[PDB]
Amino acid sequence: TXPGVTXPGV
Amino acid sequence: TXPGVTXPGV
DNA sequence: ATGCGGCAT
DNA sequence: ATGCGGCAT
């Protein structure tokens, strides 16, 4: 996720 | 995690 | 050697 | 398969 908690996605 | 058990994240 | 999300890309 | 920190505990 995020950053933080990438994307989704990337 | 923290530094610390970066941030969440970075 | 820890310690976060659990999925749209 | 792909995508973030590179630590201060």
Tokens of B1: 């995690």
Nearest CA to the C1' of C9 belongs to which residue?
Answer: A9
Cα(A9)–Cα(B5) distance, rounded to whole angstroms? 25
Does the CB of A5 sit below 7 A from strand D?
no
Q: DSSP letters of A1-10? A: -BS---BS--
CB A4 within 8 A of CB B7: yes
Tokens of A4: 């933080």
Residues of B in contact with A6 (CB under 8 A): none
Q: Is the peptide bond before A8 cis (omega within 30 degrees of 0)?
A: yes
Which experiment gave this structure?
Answer: X-ray
Query: Using CA atoms in the order B8, A3, A1, B4, what is the torsion angle rounded to 10 degrees?
Result: -20
Compute the nearest-CA separation of B9 from chain A (Å): 5
Question: Euclidean distance between the first and final Cα of chain A, in Å?
Answer: 9
Nearest CA to the C1' of D2 belongs to which residue?
Answer: A10
* Residue linked to tokens 């950053």: A3
